[PDB]
């Protein structure tokens, strides 16, 4: 599992988007789109803005 940190709150604005709160840790599913990254939290899989998350690499 690759992980991302929510840097800012994000409210879903379309059907395939996921809501997150600042500080949330999410599983990264796909980062090939420059603008939107696919993530996973709980039973949800969808997109958040790439600029709102940071990859958690040492």
């Amino acid at each position: 599992k690759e992980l991302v940190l929510a840097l800012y709150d994000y409210q879903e604005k379309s059907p395939r988007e996921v809501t997150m709160k600042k500080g949330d840790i999410l599983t990264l599913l796909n980062s090939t789109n420059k603008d939107w990254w696919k993530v996973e939290v709980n039973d949800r899989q969808g997109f958040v803005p790439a600029a709102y998350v940071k990859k958690l690499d040492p």
């Binding site: 800012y8 604005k13 603008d35 939107w36 803005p49 709102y52």
Partner: peptide
């Protein structure tokens, strides 16, 4: 916060 995308 940053801008959303389009």
């Amino acid at each position: 916060p940053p801008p959303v995308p389009p």
